[PDB]
């Protein structure tokens, strides 16, 4: 939820919310609905203090003086707990409209309703193509040829889009997780591996609202009903819930690692239900444009990493209309897939400012909340598919150089 | 299920099954029940061939010759599909008793009803104790002091016995998985990472019967209802289901790796719902005592590994009475926990011979099935708890030597 204070011309200026609503191609009226609703809530919270205030003007000098105004102090003491309710059903009606307002869209964000108008802002890398000596194979056919996944036996076991990693497939995955974690460790990041369970209660306060809520796997189990996490970002957001964080602790840098479960996948390993993910999770103070410097820091770390792997890519800024509710601004790094000659998304990078922080009561007198950003570094299975296509030869695949140490210095996976 | 042929004095000797039943402290009568039930099944399968045989003795020479025996060939052709049913409800009654017979208990197995009488057969390692200079801490208090798990924030997120790994905790876990996988790779093992999902249909044919069936997490999800795997052994067993395997492919050696989910756990990380596991999975021919040599091979690999980590241990042979239904014979490697001065189980090692193979129709003329063995190498979280206790000092923990390369050559985790 956004800050009710960004709606009050008493403390202004609500037109900023109105602009954000326009850019999100969503209700501008709801900004008037909510102002009226706040008006009521703070009236009733004062129509309480009307009774509270009269209350010690009635019990002013009952003993220190006879009088029958103590039949009225029965009406008042009682009245104080009548308005006591009104406040509670005002605030709740206010919260039901407020919950629907997306985060304030940053002015740098391209305004448009369609991802088709999504804006490329940076290129890097020399893109391979099929020549007539080398017809470039797709990840699907390179996996089979290489013998490093069993999607057939995987599908009969876990159902559709289910895979085993096998032999040098498993080493590669593990190779990439450790390259990932050390890469981030060197840049001041602290590992966190969350549980792949989250209580629906907590999840309710997390993710990106009604869009990422009733579309996870359910786990029946032991205590409360639980979800399988879709993204390490979710649990990591819940770390530091209801906590205070001290200016001196910030910034915080968690290299998140977990297995990931998504219901909406659609035999390869790009389009899957289960997969592993390293993520950059970062908390900042809310002032001094600290979260905006941190977005650049994370985006640079994602670029540096895809450069280390020598994977050609392009960076796209996402249109205001495509931003989800938490995100104030967002980049994709889309990486080159030679066989099909398309860019595909391997990284998403978001500044969500205080939007989740305010829900998870993650505090920084008059209520300041911290800024939180999240940036996939590598979905390993996808990243591998990208690596197989870009490093293929006539009779196998060359291992990226940075990943050769974590594979015992092997440099080539031969076709079977 | 055991081989119905091990019950037939026609092909003998059923007393061997009777002995196994005694050693398992279970019904000996059921061996007579089942002989009678097989008798019926093969009678009715012949009371079919009674009709089938008469059938071409009636349709002997109908054309090649008048006669009204073709009113009888109506009774017969029909009768052939009456007994056709009897066979199908005989075999099914036979299967309902047969399903309850545990695997043939190996003669080397100590006969007894109580794990209390579980037989120590080998020691290794010099066990540390609390001296009055060094009071030895437990894994629970070493984790907190070291700052490498958050069981508090973990518990509020995933519910009870839920943990984050953190900083050098995560490196250690990853360190141990890779030490594990390379260790086994050098000994002729091939990585397999299964899916953490299995369709209940398949799981039904897997695990150790009614004891390991209605006690997994349930996953609601997309297609059929699924379980979270309790052990990498389960999926790996389903690999090669309904397949033939060629003498020349055997032996097979899968180093299984997965995350693992158990409902029955009971703040530390020893007694947990989610954890990771490397396992030795091995398939052999059924002859030439090949599975029995393979059990020794795997047991030696488990010993070598706990020696590499310099963890003192003892090997126990499990009493006939404690063997589950799949297991013909079983060892535990129980490792030394100094603070509490107890041995705790870090490895289980089973020869299940053809028991699952016969259910999963995993074939090797007259029906031969392969032998399958399974042996945990490391439950990482437990293995770490063991490592923290045995390598502690006054102001932190020394990293095992073999694990120092996979931690960038760090040799000490300092207390906070």
**Alpha-carbon dihedral angle through residues A32, A37, A40, A41, given to the nearest 10 degrees:** -140
Whether residue B251 is preceded by a cis peptide bond, meaning omega within 30 degrees of 0, is yes
What lies within 8 Å, CB to CB, of A17 at 6+ separation is: A2, A6, A7, A31, A101, A104
Interface of B with A in 125-164 (CB under 8 A): 150, 153-154, 156-160, 162-164
CATH of the domain at A56: 1.10.287.40
How far apart are the C-alpha atoms of A164 and A177, rounded to whole Å?
17
Is residue A108 situated within a structural domain?
Answer: no
Of B160, B198, B223, the CB nearest to A223: B160
Per DSSP, what are the bridge partners of residue B256? B192, B279
How far apart are the C-alpha atoms of A295 and B50, rounded to whole Å?
83
How far apart are the C-alpha atoms of B275 and B379, rounded to whole Å?
7
Please tell me whether residues B276 and B381 are part of one structural domain: yes
Q: Where are the alpha helices (DSSP H) in A71-199?
A: 72-98, 139-146, 151-158, 168-186
Please tell me whether residues B120 and B83 are part of one structural domain: no
Environment class of B213 (CB within 10 Å of its CB; exposed 0-12, middle 13-18, buried 19+): middle
Provide the shortest C-alpha distance from residue A402 to chain B (in Å). 15
Is residue B358 situated within a structural domain?
Answer: yes
For residue A88, report the phi and psi dihedrals to the nearest 5 degrees.
Answer: -70, -30
Please tell me whether residues B347 and B387 are part of one structural domain: yes
How far apart are the C-alpha atoms of B316 and B334, rounded to whole Å?
8
Is residue B108 situated within a structural domain?
Answer: no
Can you spell out the DSSP letters for B134-178? --PPPHHHHHHHHT-EEHHHHHHHH-TT--EEETHHHHHHHHHHH
The nearest alpha carbon in chain B to A257 belongs to B170
User: What number of helices (H) and strands (E) belong to chain A?
Assistant: 11, 16
Q: Where are the alpha helices (DSSP H) in A187-289?
A: 200-204, 233-238
Residue B138: C-alpha distances to residues A37, B125, B207, B304, B338 (Å): 56, 19, 33, 25, 8
First to last CA, chain A: 54
Is residue B106 situated within a structural domain?
Answer: no
Tokens at B367, concatenated: 């029906």
For residue B405, report the phi and psi dihedrals to the nearest 5 degrees.
Answer: -55, -45
Please tell me whether residues B153 and B88 are part of one structural domain: no
How far apart are the C-alpha atoms of B36 and B7, rounded to whole Å?
10
Is residue B276 situated within a structural domain?
Answer: yes
How far apart are the C-alpha atoms of B250 and B263, rounded to whole Å?
35
Is residue B109 situated within a structural domain?
Answer: no
How far apart are the C-alpha atoms of A119 and B47, rounded to whole Å?
79
How far apart are the C-alpha atoms of B58 and B211, rounded to whole Å?
53
Whether residue A319 is preceded by a cis peptide bond, meaning omega within 30 degrees of 0, is no
Task: Single out the residue of A182, A110, A144 nearest to residue A331, CA to CA.
Answer: A110
Task: Single out the residue of A355, A347, A400, A352 nearest to residue A376, CA to CA.
Answer: A347
What lies within 8 Å, CB to CB, of B333 at 6+ separation is: B302, B303, B306, B313, B314, B315, B345, B346, B347, B349
Task: Single out the residue of B332, B347, B300, B353 nearest to residue B187, CA to CA.
Answer: B300
Please tell me whether residues A51 and A144 are part of one structural domain: no
Q: Kindly tell me the sign of the dihedral angle through the C-alpha atoms of A78, A84, A90, A96.
A: negative
Tokens at A323, concatenated: 């931003």
Interface of B with A in 195-254 (CB under 8 A): 195-199, 202, 217-224, 226, 228, 235, 238-241
CA atoms within 13 A on the CB side of A74: 5
Whether residue A251 is preceded by a cis peptide bond, meaning omega within 30 degrees of 0, is yes
Residue burial B257-276, b: 16+ Cβ < 10 Å; e: rest: bbbbbbeeeebbbbbbbbbb
Resolution of the coordinates in A? 2.6
Q: Which residues of A touch B228 (CB under 8 A)?
A: 219
Tokens at A107, concatenated: 């002015």
* Residue pair B243/B364 in contact by the 8 Å Cβ criterion: no
What lies within 8 Å, CB to CB, of B387 at 6+ separation is: B172, B309, B311, B397, B400
Task: Single out the residue of B109, B124, B151 nearest to residue B303, CA to CA.
Answer: B124
Interface of B with A in 29-58 (CB under 8 A): none
* Residue pair B278/B306 in contact by the 8 Å Cβ criterion: no
- How many of the other CB atoms lie within 10 Å of CB of A56? 9
CATH of the domain at B162: 3.30.930.10
Classify residue A230 by its DSSP letter. S
**Radius of gyration of the CA atoms of chain B, in A:** 27
**Alpha-carbon dihedral angle through residues B181, B186, B187, B192, given to the nearest 10 degrees:** 40
- Helix A168-186 to helix A380-390 angle (10° resolution) is 110
**Radius of gyration of the CA atoms of chain A, in A:** 27
Of B153, B219, B235, the CB nearest to A239: B153
How far apart are the C-alpha atoms of B283 and B249, rounded to whole Å?
10
Provide the shortest C-alpha distance from residue A197 to chain B (in Å). 5
Q: Kindly give the pairing relationship between strand A252-261 and strand A190-193.
A: parallel
Tokens 């518990």 -> residue: B155
Percentages helix, strand, coil for chain A (3-state, rounded to 5) are 40, 20, 40
How far apart are the C-alpha atoms of B196 and B188, rounded to whole Å?
25
Can you spell out the DSSP letters for B212-231? SSSSS-EE-SSSS-EEEPS-
Tokens at B46, concatenated: 């012949």
**Alpha-carbon dihedral angle through residues A197, A201, A206, A212, given to the nearest 10 degrees:** 80
Q: Kindly give the pairing relationship between strand A342-351 and strand A329-337.
A: antiparallel
How far apart are the C-alpha atoms of B316 and B114, rounded to whole Å?
13
Tokens 């205030």 -> residue: A53
Classify residue B4 by its DSSP letter. G
Tokens at B338, concatenated: 């100094």
What lies within 8 Å, CB to CB, of A109 at 6+ separation is: A23, A317, A318, A319, A320, A323, A328, A329
Of B156, B157, B170, the CB nearest to A191: B170
How far apart are the C-alpha atoms of B110 and B132, rounded to whole Å?
40
Whether residue B106 is preceded by a cis peptide bond, meaning omega within 30 degrees of 0, is no
Can you spell out the DSSP letters for A5-36? GGG-S----THHHHHHHHHTT--SHHHHHHHH
> Strands across the sheet with A252-261, in order?
A119-124, A313-317, A329-337, A342-351, A371-379, A274-284, A252-261, A190-193, B164-166, B149-150
Q: Is A290 on the interface with B (CB under 8 A)?
A: no
Task: Single out the residue of B387, B380, B376 nearest to residue B413, CA to CA.
Answer: B387
Please tell me whether residues A282 and A203 are part of one structural domain: yes
Q: Is A275 on the interface with B (CB under 8 A)?
A: no
Please tell me whether residues A42 and A123 are part of one structural domain: no
How far apart are the C-alpha atoms of A72 and B77, rounded to whole Å?
101
Tokens at A348, concatenated: 């998403």
Of B167, B191, B220, the CB nearest to A191: B167
The SS3 assignment for A322 reads helix
Tokens 């602290």 -> residue: A190
Which of A146, A154, A157, A189 should we substitute to test contact with B (largest number of B Cβ atoms within 10 Å)? Answer: A157
Q: Please indicate the experimental technique that yielded this structure.
A: X-ray
Is residue B79 situated within a structural domain?
Answer: yes
Give kind and range of the element (H or E) at residue B252.
Answer: strand B252-261
How many beta-carbon pairs below 8 A join chains A and B?
Answer: 171
Can you spell out the DSSP letters for A55-79? HHHHSSSSS------TTHHHHHHHH
Classify residue A407 by its DSSP letter. G
The SS3 assignment for A252 reads strand
Tokens at A98, concatenated: 């407020």
- How many of the other CB atoms lie within 10 Å of CB of A141? 13
Q: Is A70 on the interface with B (CB under 8 A)?
A: no
CA atoms within 13 A on the CB side of B175: 26
User: What number of helices (H) and strands (E) belong to chain B?
Assistant: 11, 16
Q: Which domain holds residue B221?
A: 115-414
- How many of the other CB atoms lie within 10 Å of CB of B103? 23
The SS3 assignment for A237 reads helix
* Residue pair B144/B413 in contact by the 8 Å Cβ criterion: no
* Residue pair B199/B226 in contact by the 8 Å Cβ criterion: yes
Please tell me whether residues B122 and B94 are part of one structural domain: no
Please tell me whether residues A237 and A334 are part of one structural domain: yes
End position of a domain, from candidates B67, B98, B129: B98
Please tell me whether residues B149 and B73 are part of one structural domain: no
Classify residue A289 by its DSSP letter. T
The nearest alpha carbon in chain B to A234 belongs to B157
Environment class of A121 (CB within 10 Å of its CB; exposed 0-12, middle 13-18, buried 19+): exposed
Task: Single out the residue of A87, A56, A90, A94 nearest to residue A73, CA to CA.
Answer: A56
How far apart are the C-alpha atoms of A317 and A332, rounded to whole Å?
7
Task: Single out the residue of B351, B334, B222, B259 nearest to residue B297, CA to CA.
Answer: B351
What lies within 8 Å, CB to CB, of B332 at 6+ separation is: B118, B315, B316, B318, B345, B347, B348, B349
Tokens at A128, concatenated: 């391979």
Please tell me whether residues B45 and B179 are part of one structural domain: no
Task: Single out the residue of A182, A136, A141 nearest to residue A342, CA to CA.
Answer: A136
How far apart are the C-alpha atoms of A51 and A58, rounded to whole Å?
10
A255-A256-A258 Cα angle (round to 5): 145
Is residue A162 situated within a structural domain?
Answer: yes
For residue A165, report the phi and psi dihedrals to the nearest 5 degrees.
Answer: -75, 150
How far apart are the C-alpha atoms of A197 and A195, rounded to whole Å?
5
How far apart are the C-alpha atoms of B374 and B348, rounded to whole Å?
8
Please tell me whether residues A220 and A270 are part of one structural domain: yes
Per DSSP, what are the bridge partners of residue A166? B192
What lies within 8 Å, CB to CB, of B42 at 6+ separation is: none
A218 and B217 within 8 Å at the Cβ level: the answer is: no
Q: How many domains does chain A have?
A: 2
Tokens at A73, concatenated: 């102090």
Can you spell out the DSSP letters for B62-127? SS------TTHHHHHHHHHHHHHHHHHHHHHHHHHHHTTPPP---TTSPP-S-GGG-EEEEEES--
How far apart are the C-alpha atoms of B27 and A289, rounded to whole Å?
76
Task: Single out the residue of B319, B237, B315 nearest to residue B283, CA to CA.
Answer: B237
Tokens at B394, concatenated: 């006054």
What lies within 8 Å, CB to CB, of A373 at 6+ separation is: A280, A281, A282, A284, A291, A294, A295, A298, A349, A350, A351, A352
End position of a domain, from candidates A98, A131, A161: A98
* Residue pair A354/A369 in contact by the 8 Å Cβ criterion: yes
């Amino acid at each position: 939820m956004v800050d009710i204070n960004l709606f009050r011309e008493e403390k202004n200026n609500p037109e900023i919310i109105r602009e954000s609503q326009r850019r999100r191609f969503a209700s501008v009226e709801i900004v008037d609905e909510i102002i009226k609703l706040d008006k009521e809530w703070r009236q009733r919270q004062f129509e309480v203090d009307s009774f509270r205030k009269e209350f010690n003007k009635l019990n002013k000098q009952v003993a220190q003086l006879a009088s029958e105004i103590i039949q009225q102090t029965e009406k008042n003491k009682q009245d104080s707990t009548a308005k006591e309710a009104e406040v509670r059903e005002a605030y709740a009606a206010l919260k039901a409209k407020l919950e629907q307002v997306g985060n304030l869209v940053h002015d740098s964000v391209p305004v448009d309703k369609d991802e088709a108008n999504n804006l490329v802002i940076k290129l890097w890398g020399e893109k391979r193509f099929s020549t007539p000596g080398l017809k470039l194979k797709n990840h699907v056919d390179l996996v089979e040829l290489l013998g490093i996944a069993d999607t057939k036996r995987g599908a009969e076991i876990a159902g559709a889009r289910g895979f085993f990693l096998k032999g040098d497939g498993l080493m590669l995955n593990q190779a990439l997780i450790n390259f990932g974690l050390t890469f981030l460790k060197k840049r001041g990041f602290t590992g966190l591996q969350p549980p792949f369970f989250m209580r629906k209660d907590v999840m309710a306060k997390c993710a990106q609202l009604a869009q990422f809520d009733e579309e996870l796997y359910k786990v029946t189990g032991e205590g409360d009903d639980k979800y399988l996490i879709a993204t390490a970002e979710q649990p990591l957001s819940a770390y530091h819930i209801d906590e205070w964080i001290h200016p001196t602790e910030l910034p915080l840098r968690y290299a998140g690692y977990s297995s990931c479960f998504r219901k909406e996948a659609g035999l390869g390993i790009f389009r899957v239900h289960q997969f592993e993910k390293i993520e950059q999770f970062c908390i900042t103070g809310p002032n001094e444009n600290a979260s905006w410097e941190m977005l650049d820091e994370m985006m640079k770390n994602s670029e540096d990493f895809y450069q280390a792997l020598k994977l050609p890519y392009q960076i796209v800024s996402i249109v205001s209309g495509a931003l989800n509710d938490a995100a104030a601004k967002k980049y994709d790094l889309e990486a080159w897939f030679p066989s099909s000659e398309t860019f595909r998304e391997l990284v998403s990078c978001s500044n969500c400012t205080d939007y989740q922080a305010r829900r998870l009561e993650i505090r920084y007198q008059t209520k300041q909340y911290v800024h939180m950003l999240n940036s996939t570094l590598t979905a390993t299975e996808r990243t591998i598919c990208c690596i197989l296509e870009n490093y293929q030869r006539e009779d196998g695949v060359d291992i990226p150089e940075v990943l050769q140490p974590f594979m015992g210095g092997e440099t080539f996976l031969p076709f079977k």
